[PDB]
Ligand binder design. Structure first.
Ligand SMILES: CN[C@@H](C)C(=O)N[C@H](C(=O)N1CC[C@H]2CC[C@H](NC(=O)C(c3ccccc3)c3ccccc3)[C@H]21)C(C)(C)C
Ligand SMILES: [Zn+2]
Length: 90
């Protein structure tokens, strides 16, 4: 199961980005869709399922790409995007 079942809802994850500092650079909509919620500190986010944390986001970063790059074993990622997607990023 998920590390943090309470953030399994995409809408709850999106709400967590109310004070996100990088709206134009890395959209909250895409971060939330990709399993991430905002910790509230700087640009630190975490996936609700694998609990993997990512920070130091660069403008134009693709949240799903970064998810697969750093946490390829995440089952939410696999369920959502499929194995071919994960394999191609590697
Ligand atoms: C350029 N795109 C971004 C999304 C990126 O690749 N970020 C990397 C990243 O954040 N990573 C890579 C994979 C993870 C391991 C190293 C880094 N982890 C953290 O920064 C976490 C952390 C560890 C120790 C002290 C403070 C923070 C972290 C924890 C919770 C939330 C966010 C990050 C995570 C970085 C900083 C190494 C370029
Ligand atoms: Zn994950």
């Amino acid at each position: 199961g998920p590390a943090f079942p309470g953030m399994g809802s995409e809408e709850l994850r999106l709400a967590s980005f109310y004070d996100w500092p990088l709206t134009a650079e890395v959209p909250p909509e895409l971060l939330a869709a990709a399993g991430f919620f905002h910790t509230g500190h700087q640009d630190k986010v975490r996936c609700f399922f694998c609990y993997g944390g990512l920070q130091s986001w660069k403008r134009g970063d693709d949240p799903w790409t970064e998810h697969a790059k750093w946490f390829p074993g995440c089952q939410f990622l696999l369920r959502s995007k499929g194995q071919e997607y994960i394999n191609n990023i590697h």
